[model samples]
Target: DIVDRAKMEDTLKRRFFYDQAFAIYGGVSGLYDFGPVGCALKNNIIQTWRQHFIQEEQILEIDCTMLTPEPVLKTSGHVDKFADFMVKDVKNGECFRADHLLKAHLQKLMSDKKCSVEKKSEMESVLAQLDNYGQQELADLFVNYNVKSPITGNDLSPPVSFNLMFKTFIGPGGNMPGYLRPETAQGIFLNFKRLLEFNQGKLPFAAAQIGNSFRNEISPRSGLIRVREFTMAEIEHFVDPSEKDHPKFQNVADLHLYLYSAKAQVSGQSARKMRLGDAVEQGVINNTVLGYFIGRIYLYLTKVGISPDKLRFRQHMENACDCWDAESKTSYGWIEIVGCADRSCYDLSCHARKRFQKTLYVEEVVPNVIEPSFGLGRIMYTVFEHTFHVREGQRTFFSFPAVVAPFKCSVLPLSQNQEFMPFVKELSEALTRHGVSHKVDDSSGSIGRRYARTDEIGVAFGVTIDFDTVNKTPHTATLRDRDSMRQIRAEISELPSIVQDLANGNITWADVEARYPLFEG
Candidate 1:
């Protein structure tokens, strides 16, 4: 399996999945553009997220402007709190993130010790959980052992907050000060009244927005994992404080998940398979609603083909978590990747107080929020990294889920002969009419080579139009499965329905093989 990270990075670079943005005009540090395949894969992932999370759940999604006024952010506590820890280099004066530097320092210490591999793994776990720790504790970790910057080999200055906004002038007069939004929740928060009115003054409805959220990264070296111009599919699930209980919790309470509890981290233990209900009942997740959403996220990640062994729902540390709850019993190390927070009227309260428009008011004033925010780009990068597989002497293919694969299927004409070309065109049109997103690969390369190309991009199905299509009664085509590289011959009319079922995960290759004669090439 492609566990070699450096090799995966090289493959991504050669495949043109993404390029450092604005490279010709002196590349900027924290931005990127998804190339053709990258763009398609990204869009497919987001679309699947929308369908499963929004359409199926009946959540309303809105698109808002990224250019937000300074006053809005200021009132939302972002002016002071929306920041990164900045630490500058002693020799080159190069600015670096205090947290990142601290992470690097700890990682190096773990390395230098040359401790047991298990101990190093434990150290790595603690380092990952350190974001949930307080400033004083982090400082103590550094001071106790003398942590220093990697470059210049100089001791770092004490950590301090640096605002991450990229400001711009609003008009020719240049009177209005605006900043790029740090998160999409603010935009939804500002329009709370409109959304509430639209929902007929509902207290338990959600509004979603998927778009770019900016952050200036001091050391953005993790490739696409950390970037300034990254996409986020965030949901502001506005629920009443009293009614945070979900009606559908029972449906998913039995769903099993690998939860990396905060206490487990403090005690230096790996994740455990806990039922979602047990997680909430044991007070690992904040509440039932929060637990339910977390379970859903876990399912979605796995559904998108992330390795089950690599997935875990980490609880935020007490410092990062809500201390107001009676259940909190931890000291450090939890930064949520997909956080479901009980924002008790914080966002709506801020907007109401600032505007003073009397626009944000519930019938009985039931104000509380249960927000589950997702970083789409971060998830995409995670999926790409963890699922990358390279067998020593076999072909390499991305093991993406059928539901989120960039192309649902690809049609390959067996040969470029004019006799077989017409069937390829008609079958492609049939796939299109059946609402299956597909591609036509009629390259001069051998059929196996063409199949390999389709497999690399994670297309779920491949249809081959061969000489059999001309000779067989009612025009037969060979449909192949990408993951198994298995094929079965089927009547051309039934091909679209089969591909559709394969896309939706309702059927598998074995089922197709059982129904028809196996296709051998």
Candidate 2:
């Protein structure tokens, strides 16, 4: 399938899926407002995540505040280490992320027809490990490339680290400094004591939280991939230091995945595809627990319509333990959707000892944490780009799967006839009663055209209430599948039930088509 982001961006704004926040005030960068469709799609992704990870694994889900005291982040290292290298336009004072600016410039050069192959490879390697460069290294690289401001075409200043968290004072006195939480994982880690007690002091347990995280990026673009305020769903699985293995590890070990390893990247090779178990056994992935979550995250992404061919678990430059991020392909290149890191008793120990002077008899009780942090906005945008479609002629539509579709079905009144009115209303009521969210297309149109219009918004099924429905005893309507453009005739009353089954993935359209009578015209 072709990845056409321009078309998708146009559709997003035209349909009001999402738009720039505070547009009348001359909108700000790194911020956006999700409209009805965007809201629905985001919520559906979160709900699916809950069912897949939180509910299925019985992870404790907590709703934590977005605000955090400065002391908390100071212990977690966000106050010191959560910063990106930034270089400013010497003349215009416009700041840009040092790595991002470097990558964009190198990418453009790599695309040139006259660029030498050796030079291209060198730049490619530099791009791959952009963040590995330090301030002096970045300054030298900027001088090497003669990179300048794209906005003002001015000389750039030497790069320096800029803390991305939004800071503020907690009270009027300005004594209690605070910051917006940079990651939801910290909140989970802070609650470690009460959580362990709640679990009867268990050796292995999980806690998760879904909330907004703030990062004041030097420069943000590429739609939802990088934003100032975005939704994060994070799980922190705690385990005794002695045991890093999960009892159910075997269940996912056999699963195959595209593993982009640090060795492969550094040694000049492509991503390797292999079984999850083999990677861990071979020591490509550090631990069984880390490998297990990598496998689970892969399953979760594919379940939400991320193509396996396009998604890979890339090992980050190894951290507390082996760190892997679930990076998925898009027109904007592969972006990190979920970052899986194994923190070996760092967080809990850091917070416990940082401020609390008195011992709490929890010295050996410190547990290792394996975290999977999901960036909801990035995943949502990836789906839109991944599922976009175009048929013959200029007919284009989103082909979002049933689980991801904003609405399960659209109700189309087949004609302007007065008799069609009640069927549409009653059918809509039936759908609502069954907890199905639907859109009613009662405006003037032929049935085919109306169905076509709804297709653009990615309605999986369309119910057409025609003249025969009022005349027929069963009050039948034709259900049209968006992809197949085929129709099955069924009673209006049972429409919601079938749609519910379809949306929940409980029944397939093939099974549905087999059960219902075929429709003509």
Candidate 3:
């Protein structure tokens, strides 16, 4: 409710966070260009994800091609099944997702005073599993409900399964068929043999990929929520089918999370908080390998500043035991940000995983892939909205954690005084030398005004060069904390390392307050 719907957008543009990709030539939908702040922030997020998952879990991170061949996808069953039910506006030829249209039309009909309770109940049931409906099921609903074009009021064409992957030619020859990889999973699967061999025929090794994927949707809206081209971070933890237990399950067994089991959904109850270990023990989660990843995912999102209260793991209806969708509640309502699944041997068998048993004189077996894939852009957007806060009445700021804030610090020469410029240069140089991302704001504004701009950009720490720095022999400046608006004066020579420590979570603001002199103003 506190989201900036108007001035919010204005600040994003004013601060060069993000905007339309090709505005001068009239931008198209589903595409965006990240400005300086947005770029730095997104990269920071990806870097954090790498360290949290890959570095911590001993997962081998790999890079695969975005341009994938046809046979690979066909072999993976994606070419045949990776599709969405689409319906076209008969007159305009514009397409829409069949289930979405049906769901929306039914909801409107159910809300009418003339609608009976029985019919409402039936419609509500349909809404509960709307996404799982088959093409024929959606088509039947459209005809029965007389669903039409949202704007034209014209009839719609029959629903048909449409592949969302963007197709393309391999080379100038134009004969070979290929696609701008719809997902990063298949790419990782193709290299399964190589990855496994790299592990010296080891089981329980994970291969992670962070890359861009393409999905040509019928309609793309909601800003970054449904972009055609987006980033994904996927981890496929392969474990022996017979040995589904994880070595480090104990590390996260005690953690509790909001779990929306299929039973809860069917019983018309909400998600319940449960211990991860209990969920695994009771079969709510299939195995410990998958359960451990869910715990890791929970900790990762929590570290990324996603409010735990607004997050839940909803079991997918069709595949209850195998998959859980990590959803975040934002102004747009709950949207899936992470997809955790025990995909079984579908990945290895489809690509290649045979004769290894014969080579070792053991029973034939394939490793089960326990995966936790992420929507990077979606996570970024959720973090932005979730951290959005109203401070001191009307004024607002995104209380972004120091680790992921766009600019970790803002170095200002208060009031653009000549005396302050030298300190600003020295501080900026030292900050850059120490690898701290910061901005130098000598925009001819008052310190108060400068502070507002920094807050608007979500700068974690603000350092101001004042008269005290020039007059004093030691050259001291005030360090401003964005989260609490508290200032602590410290020497200019020591400010860079202090800000670096603060940004990297090496020391708390409280630690600095106790050490340095507090500036009341």
Candidate 4:
């Protein structure tokens, strides 16, 4: 039933979706290379995101360098504060992410019936505020709970600061220090003055970047959930501090969102589903602009196939506090896939001070920014997991929506006869002319096995050419639906437009069925 990750991994590899990077060299953790199917799906996802956010929202896009100088990161507070807590096994020197280790231990303790209710509540409190705990505090937790290394069962060393940035030299002389960019937002922030000039000093505008960012993670696991190198799509929406209202607020005003507010989290309450307008009006969300972006993120994620029930917006405690030392946190058992924060001029102001440049909009005005940062790999992995399914408890298939599927359809010839070549060639040419991506399967295999193969790789539709088309007048082909496995007979002349329409989401299967006769082929 496609119940476990091992089965999913096998399918992904067998179908050429993605695989461990550098497998010939023993591979590296947290790094993967996308194959044909995976690359197509990833490109489609990126294109959809660009259409939904950058073009639809009228935000400017930029391609920034991956290697950034030390000064820029130092000014952005990343140099001093971008670190995670880590502990090592005393016996074998294996390291663990302290928060992850601590949270696991606490969760195990809470599940034990022998543990007192008060003790469980205290452990929950620590977890709720785990991100805010300092190095010493985590060390104390480890000591008090006698939390040992899960791998070796050995006592762990005191928690220490592990900087996540990958530091390097910019030149051969090794004189100028640099680091691989950890986030994409800094590129937008550094070019604030130029972007303002490009916007003619507009009061509110956004700059977006979709690019690779590197983080030297101490211990990355859970597939693509955490990684050393991944794609990030970040938006820095600059607005006047005094006016945080968005002109397009009404567009998403009535949209309901799952919000885990700071207060509800501290009080151990569940997240509430509230309308965007209500969230803003009741001060549950800070401002209309922030609330608007939150709704946009919700819409974008769901559009690309993330489960709404598994997604929620948790208020990062550090976001509202807006202090240098404040740490961010998430709630509701949901990992942060998208982070929307009102970082009131923190980025531009910091960079401007260091670069000795003007950061004003009109009259020494430092514009506040609302950032909606998205982890592309995380979203893609979630989409894969959600779309994967097994039919009849045996046949594995991916039910990816046509809009993001690796291929729109698979073209197959019913037999090895030469008579089918003309039809297959004509169909392939038509699909290519219409910009519909498809694969032709002419190998020696049972038609049913071929269908299964195509469906497994997420081809939404299949076109089969048989004797009915070759020997009959007004040639027709059978169009098969991937998920439903239903067939409809359509004239060969109209197959291109029908498949194109379906791929573009201009028409539904029911619409096609209403036009064409159902086929028993």
Task: Kindly list the per-residue Cα lDDT of model 1 for residues 368-401, writing each as its tens digit.
Answer: 6667777776677666766676644566777777
Worst 10 residues of 1 by lDDT: 324-333
Give the per-residue lDDT of model 4 (tens digit) for 1-521: 22456767789998878888999999889898999889999998899899999998899998889999988888877875999888988878899999999999999989999999999889987887788887777789999999999875999999999889998999886779999999999898878877877887667889999999999988776667778999889898888787778988899899886777778877879877778798889988777888778888888887787767666777755523321111112221246677777876476666666122234543566677888888887777777777777788467888888878887889888777888888888999999999988889876788888898888888899998888899998899999998888999999879999999988759999999999999984
Error of 2 at 85 (Å): 2.1
The residue pairs found clashing in candidate 3 are none
Worst 10 residues of 2 by lDDT: 354-363
TM-score of each: 0.87, 0.90, 0.93, 0.91
- Over 357-462, each residue of candidate 2 has an lDDT whose tens digit, in order, gives 1124555555677989999988888788778887886777888877777888898775667777788888888888987878888767567777777787787888
Report model 2's TM-score to 2 decimal places.
0.90
Please give the lDDT score at residue 300 for candidate 3: 86
Model 4 lDDT, residue 68, Cα: 96
Pairs in clash, predicted candidate 1 = 2-390, 317-334
Candidate 1: what lDDT? 0.73
lDDT against the true structure, each candidate: 0.73, 0.83, 0.83, 0.81
Q: After superposition, how far is residue 475 of candidate 2 from its true place, in Å?
A: 3.0
Candidate 1 vs. true structure, TM-score: 0.87
- Local error of candidate 1 at residue 32 (angstroms): 1.4
